[PDB]
Design a protein around this ligand. Structure first.
Ligand SMILES: [Mg+2]
Ligand SMILES: [Mg+2]
Length: 821
RNA sequence: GCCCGGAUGGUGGAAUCGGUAGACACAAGGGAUCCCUCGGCGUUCGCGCUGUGCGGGUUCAAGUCCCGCUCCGGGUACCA
């Protein structure tokens, strides 16, 4: 019989074994079913799950289990972003090498994920550090090279690097943000600003005693009459020409290479092409040599950086834009930034921003000293690292100096895993023999740098669709069946790195014919951070010592606010509130400890209950114990119910009004929970609705056969509704209730419309807008019947005593407001 | 600087379409693991006044819609 006591330790590993043995969450490309691809950002194998992993993957798993119960064919994959820096650190610190360390972390973390009962298709599990994964990005990289999308260049970080031409897709990456209605605006705005398409004008100046011109780039050509000096990047040819005869500038250039406004007068004078005036050219620290032309016309009255530099160096500050209210601006403190009507600008006075922009661009073009120009903040993607633990770059240099891709017959370029790290140099660099190779029987040197680990995370989501496919990077039929990802769950912190790279890589894959869609993921859900209480004491040395909130001993006033805290050693603690988890504040909570203390189901439930998915969640032991206690109550109710044996069939027509009202609450809950999980994604309020119903069901009668049949229906519905959140307990309870088959394949409950119909309705009676009663009336009562009933309420009548009803507002079956005077 | 979120009890937060504010849970307390009570003030226990950051507006009716303000949280920029 059913155990009386709920014991996660006797239930969770058994259900988990069942899921592995039956391969419950393994899926194929079944065209007779509607697909749903639920994806969570894959973990780095650091060694132990953190609470953010737990939140992220619980959200994914709730969604994946729900969509299955709706009858979809659901892919939920997991894997390991396994290359990267931290393994080198650890290898050196320990007796070891990056690979064994990494494989150990995977085993450990994998067992943690299974202990949490995330329903992954384990047969699609990938580790990005294996040659079976990385060979394909090696081959893809050679293809990109052949398409003209990859090149070598020396650059600052200064060293040679391999670049992929992400700028060749800048406009698509920008325009397609408008297809991403189910991405958060914050993420979209971050990518927009990162790409930074800029519409401006290049303007060329003649410079005295300089046998060249100087070209600047501006987005505010409308301010050109306020240009009081030019500034050039430290690395600009003009600055380097002047430094020939200028120690000060020479010194300044050198400092900038290494490295608050700073500059050196170049001594050169440029001629403003419209005013004829001579203006000074400075070399300045705020001017990036790599963007636009490496030079700007400075307009200190209207650019804040130009303002600060001009004040510091005594340069003229000229106003040429009116304030919003039409008034000449106050530039005594700072730049007037806003676009406005021109003054102090000759023939352009009175023009607004757009008119002035175009009039001045037009003029300078006609004069042949300017032209419209679009620039982009986006730079090409440097994918080269001088680091051991990553996929080797499949390029080779022939003795004659020809750089070319590694022949297809030498892919993959295997990174050797059995190495000894000396801590300062890559083993594949330190050994001069590794780079030696042959290409067409001519000696060749193979590349020794490895890929940026963003390389692996940029396409893993697609490889999951066909992870054992050996004929290519993607099996396109499989990929096009699963893709695009339906929901991608992970942090907002990846907004302009990975979240941009994976869109870009998707498009590269489409354009290699490998997929037939434009965007990799339809919905992006960024889960909020998990916070914990933070405490510290000040030692006798004046140093703050942070004390884990587990170890804090708190005391509270009679309304429960923390008023004093100590640690065991008796130090006085300062409470800093809820903060981001961190080693430095020492407030990290170990998910493994809570799983072992309360069971996975308690942890999962708490995490989904405590806060909306996209808001920060405040971890509280209090809350977790609450969720645990709720599970015991569910267990208890089902224990009591099943003790009493089978149930007769529910007779829906013969139910009492109290029975009808409970049954209506069951089905209204089904509908609210369905809407909340599936449309609104408010998982907290879904769980709240289940708790609310469970409270009612614990108070319902359970003697009569009808009461028991009603309870059976309710419990079969509650357990299914709980299942995506707490599936171990729900799997087991489902059997105890004698539900049909495994709960993982049971259909999501659907609300019975007949069960939800009401025989009465509550009407809120107001008098001049103030609630004076709430009356229950027949569901189809007429407005005059409702009125009559409201006047019979003494609570209302006593506000109708000796006053006149001027009018009435009535919302059928909801509200009657009697307006009186 | 600009991009957001947000501001409702002692706490975390609900309120979807303007119409019973505070669901659900924690902390309380205090009763016999279950039952109840729980925004404030008063209460004849039926309710009355008051109440969603501040100030106005719209409306029979505002947490919800518009107009200011004050305060908070988190991103993010020498890209001209
Ligand atoms: Mg010249
Ligand atoms: Mg408050």
């Amino acid at each position: 019989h059913m155990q009386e006591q709920y014991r996660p330790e006797e239930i969770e590993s058994k259900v988990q074994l069942h899921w592995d043995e039956k391969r419950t969450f393994e899926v194929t490309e079944d065209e007779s079913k509607e697909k749903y691809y639920c994806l969570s950002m894959l973990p780095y194998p650091s060694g132990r799950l953190h609470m953010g992993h737990v939140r992220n993957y619980t959200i994914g798993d709730v969604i994946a289990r729900y969509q299955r119960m709706l009858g979809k064919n659901v892919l939920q994959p997991i894997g390991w972003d396994a290359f990267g820096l931290p393994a080198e650190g650890a290898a050196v610190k320990n007796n070891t090498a990056p690979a064994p360390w990494t494989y150990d972390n995977i085993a450990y973390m994998k067992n943690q994920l299974k202990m949490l009962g995330f329903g992954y298709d384990w047969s699609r599990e990938l580790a990005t550090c294996t040659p079976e994964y990385y060979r394909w990005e090696q081959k893809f990289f050679t293809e990109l090279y052949k398409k003209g999308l990859v090149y070598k260049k020396t650059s600052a970080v200064e060293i040679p690097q391999w670049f992929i031409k992400i700028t060749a897709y800048a406009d698509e990456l920008l325009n397609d943000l408008d297809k991403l209605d189910h991405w958060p605006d914050t993420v979209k705005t971050m990518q927009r600003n990162w790409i930074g398409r800029s519409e401006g004008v290049e303007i060329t100046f003649n410079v005295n005693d300089y046998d060249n011109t100087l070209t600047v780039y501006t987005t505010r050509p409308d301010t050109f009459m306020g240009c009081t000096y030019l500034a050039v990047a430290a690395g600009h040819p003009l600055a380097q020409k002047a430094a020939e005869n200028n120690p000060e500038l020479a010194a300044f250039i050198d400092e900038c290479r290494n490295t608050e406004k700073k500059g050196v007068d170049t001594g050169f004078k440029a001629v403003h092409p419209l005013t004829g005036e001579e203006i000074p050219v400075w070399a300045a620290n705020f001017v990036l040599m790599e963007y636009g032309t490496g030079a700007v016309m400075a307009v200190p009255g209207h650019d804040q950086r130009d303002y600060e530099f001009a004040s510091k160096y005594g340069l003229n500050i000229k106003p040429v834009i009116l304030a919003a209210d039409g008034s000449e601006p106050d530039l005594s403190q700072q730049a007037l930034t806003e676009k406005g009507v021109l003054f102090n600008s000759g023939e352009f006075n009175g023009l607004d921003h757009e008119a002035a922009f175009n009039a001045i661009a037009d003029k300078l073009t006609a004069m042949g000293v300017g032209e419209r120009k679009v620039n982009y903040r986006l730079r090409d993607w440097g994918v080269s690292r001088q680091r051991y633990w990553g996929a080797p770059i499949p390029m080779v240099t022939l003795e004659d100096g020809t750089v070319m891709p590694t022949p297809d017959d030498q892919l993959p370029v295997i990174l050797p895993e059995d190495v000894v790290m000396d801590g300062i140099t890559s083993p594949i660099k330190a050994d001069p023999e590794w780079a030696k190779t042959t290409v067409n029987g001519m000696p060749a040197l193979r590349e020794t740098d490895t890929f940026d680990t963003f390389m692996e995370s940029s396409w893993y989501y697609a490889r999951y669709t066909c992870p054992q496919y050996k004929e290519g990077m993607l099996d396109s039929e499989a990929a096009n069946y699963w893709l695009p990802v339906d929901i991608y769950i992970g942090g907002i912190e990846h907004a302009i790195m990975h979240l941009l790279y994976f869109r870009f890589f998707h498009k590269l894959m489409r354009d290699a014919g490998m997929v037939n869609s434009d965007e990799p993921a339809k919905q992006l859900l960024c889960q909020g951070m998990v916070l914990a209480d933070a405490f510290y004491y000040v030692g006798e040395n004046g140093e703050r010592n942070w004390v884990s909130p587990v170890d804090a001993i708190v005391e509270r006033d009679e309304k429960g606010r923390i008023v004093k805290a100590k640690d065991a050693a008796g130090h006085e603690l300062v409470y800093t509130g809820m903060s981001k988890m961190s080693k430095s504040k020492n407030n990290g909570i170990d998910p493994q400890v809570m799983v072992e203390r309360y069971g996975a189901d308690t942890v999962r439930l708490f995490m989904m209950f405590a806060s909306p998915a996209d808001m920060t969640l405040e971890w509280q032991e209090s809350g977790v114990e609450g969720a645990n206690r709720f599970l015991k109550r569910v267990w208890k109710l089902v224990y009591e119910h099943t003790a009493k044996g089978d149930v007769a069939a529910l007779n829906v027509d013969a139910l009492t009004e109290n029975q009808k009202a409970l049954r209506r609450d069951v089905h209204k809950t089904i509908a609210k929970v369905t809407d909340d999980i599936g449309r609104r994604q408010t998982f907290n309020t879904a769980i709240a609705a289940i708790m609310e119903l469970m409270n009612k069901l614990a108070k319902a009668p359970t003697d009569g056969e009808q009461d028991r049949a009603l309870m059976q229906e309710a419990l079969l519905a509650v357990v299914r509704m709980l299942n995506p959140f707490t599936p171990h307990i729900c799997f087991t309870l489902w059997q105890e209730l004698k539900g049909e088959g495994d709960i993982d394949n049971a259909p999501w409950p659907v609300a019975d419309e007949k069960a939800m119909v009401e025989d009465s309705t509550l009407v809120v009676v107001q008098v001049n807008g103030k609630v004076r009663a709430k009356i229950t009336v027949p569901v189809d009562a007429t407005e005059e019947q409702v009125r009559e009933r409201a006047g019979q309420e003494h609570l209302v009548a006593k506000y109708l005593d000796g006053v006149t009803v001027r009018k009435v507002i009535y919302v059928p079956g909801k509200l009657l407001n009697l307006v009186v005077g």
